[PDB]
Design a protein around this ligand. Structure first.
Ligand SMILES: CC1(C)S[C@H]([C@@H](C=O)NC(=O)[C@H](NC(=O)N2CCNC2=O)c2ccccc2)N[C@H]1C(=O)O
Ligand SMILES: [Cl-]
Length: 515
């Protein structure tokens, strides 16, 4: 019974910070106390003092030790603070030992839970960034030998056979300040609107960095006691949806690149419907007989966009959408991330051509939509997405001509700023641009759509004079104060964009309305 034992030396898991060094996941030093029952059995009159110092009931504590009198090792308590373990060891109770351990702590908790994820009881990454970069972050535990006698009392630390190796630091692209702002405002809007879920993505249009990514519902990764599966989802990355009218700027980009359309062109949209075979295209706004190109986007005419689509054909539309990354692998490798679906057909009937152009029959993620709007904002130059801090600006791919992008930027500025436009999306002190959308949710137990359940969207970027930031707001089943994208999601865009631009010290380009 007198032999040497090898015990592990816990390795320090790598620090996860935001883009500026703000800790997001940190391995904190804790103290675990263990006992040698055989030794404690000789110090019985120290039990009541020891039990009390452990916050345990004298008798229940005594039952524990007695039931284990045979054993040489049992945990007393795990994960005390260093000073708490210091106090109990200082009592000098025979057979009580301490070992230094680590506990993974998440300082911003629920604010960044979906992005960062968490580690399991073996601090192996199980969700999110903790999972995706587990190899980078994980340390290598060491090993050492201890000598124990017949009764199991430790008499000597013999040697370290293997040093512990710490994991590596990882800096995310996220700006925690923006993440806090986005988290709070999304939560507020979810609650004001009695919505079921939501996502908000902010992107640096020049660098491809994800500055903020938040979802509702969320959870506290430091306390997962009553955690339900639904709250764990990074919906921005892993859930798909039909983008609806938020793809209209890309259909318009195809129209302009085709050589067949120009901004002054007028389209007749009377009577606000278009019959094609059995299916009917319907406009919601029906207070105009004709619209120029800009007014098609301002009023969000499905009939208008459909007529342009029939003229240019589906292939030109499919092509811009593929080019801006809709339904395409993002290359981020976030666990569970979806590619979505951009349908490719042998032949395109009018029906499928029209619905593609106004954003149904395809499915995207909120990250993809934001990336697509970044391309438009960045003068038609698409840059790869990143969830880690970028050192040097990546090489972009010119996916939309600068000229077309410039015109479409102007139209989207008009969608926000012009009379009859989405005025709730106006950003104090700035010129913003963007597009609202409203989509019926898909039926649960059949094909087709729900009658009274909706997804509210707004996508945009700012400032219009030199776009820095793109943002997408998606809100599921608002039920208390309307459901249109320009009612529900646009105000979120306004407030978050305002705070974001200020936090990033972007100078106001609209002083007639500044703060
Ligand atoms: C409410 C609008 C002004 S309509 C138009 C457009 C774009 O998103 N959205 C729609 O046309 C949407 N259609 C829709 O969900 N589906 C599913 C199958 N095909 C079809 O039409 C809709 C929205 C509200 C009530 C009824 C229908 N933009 C909205 C905006 O800007 O908020
Ligand atoms: Cl319904």
């Amino acid at each position: 019974a007198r032999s040497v034992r090898h015990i592990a030396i816990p390795a320090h898991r790598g620090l996860i910070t935001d883009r500026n060094g703000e800790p997001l996941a940190v391995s904190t030093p804790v103290t675990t106390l263990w006992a040698n029952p055989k030794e404690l059995m000789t110090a019985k009159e120290r039990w009541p003092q020891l039990a009390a110092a452990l916050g345990q009931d004298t008798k229940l504590f005594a039952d524990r030790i007695e039931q284990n009198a045979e054993r040489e090792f049992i945990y007393l308590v795990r994960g005390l603070t260093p000073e708490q373990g210091e106090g109990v060891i200082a009592l000098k109770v025979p057979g009580v030992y301490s070992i230094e351990e680590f506990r993974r702590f998440y300082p911003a908790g629920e604010v960044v839970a979906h992005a960062v994820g968490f580690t399991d009881v073996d601090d192996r990454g199980r969700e999110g960034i903790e999972l995706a970069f587990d190899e980078w972050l994980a340390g290598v535990p060491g090993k050492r030998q201890v000598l124990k006698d017949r009764r199991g009392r430790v008499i000597k630390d013999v040697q370290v056979t293997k040093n512990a190796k710490p994991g590596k630091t990882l800096a995310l692209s996220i700006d925690l300040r923006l993440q806090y702002l986005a988290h709070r405002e999304l939560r507020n809007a979810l609650l004001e609107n009695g919505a079921k879920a939501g996502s908000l993505v902010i992107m640096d249009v020049k660098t491809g960095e994800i500055l903020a990514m938040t979802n509702q519902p969320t959870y506290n990764p430091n306390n997962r006691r009553n955690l339900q599966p639904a709250a764990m989802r990074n919906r921005a990355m892993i859930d798909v949806f039909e983008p609806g009218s938020t793809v209209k700027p890309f259909s318009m980009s195809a129209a302009l690149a085709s050589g067949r359309w120009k901004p002054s062109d007028i389209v007749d949209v009377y009577p606000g419907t278009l019959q094609i075979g059995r299916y009917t295209i319907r406009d919601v706004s029906r207070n105009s007989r004709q619209l120029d190109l800009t007014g098609i986007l301002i009023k969000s005419s499905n009939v208008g966009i459909s007529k342009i689509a029939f003229d240019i054909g589906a292939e030109s539309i499919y092509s811009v959408m593929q080019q801006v990354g809709l339904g395409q692998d993002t290359g981020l490798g976030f666990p569970g991330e979806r590619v979505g679906n951009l349908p490719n057909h042998r032949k395109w009937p009018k029906a499928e051509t029209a619905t593609l152009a106004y954003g149904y029959g395809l499915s995207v993620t909120a990250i993809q939509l934001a990336h697509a709007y970044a391309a438009l904002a960045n003068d038609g130059k698409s840059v790869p997405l990143s969830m880690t801090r970028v050192d040097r600006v990546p090489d972009g791919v010119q996916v939309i001509s600068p000229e077309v992008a410039s015109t479409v930027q102007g139209m989207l500025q008009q969608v926000v700023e012009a009379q009859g436009g989405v005025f709730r999306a106006q950003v104090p002190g700035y010129h913003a641009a963007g597009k609202s959308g409203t989509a019926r949710k898909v039926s649960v137990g059949t094909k087709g759509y729900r009658e009274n359940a909706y997804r509210s969207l707004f996508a945009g970027f700012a400032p219009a004079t030199d776009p820095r930031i793109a943002m997408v707001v998606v809100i599921d089943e608002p039920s208390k104060a309307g459901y249109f994208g320009g009612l529900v999601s646009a105000p979120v865009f306004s407030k978050v964009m305002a705070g974001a631009l200020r936090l990033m010290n972007v100078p106001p380009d609209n002083l007639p309305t500044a703060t």
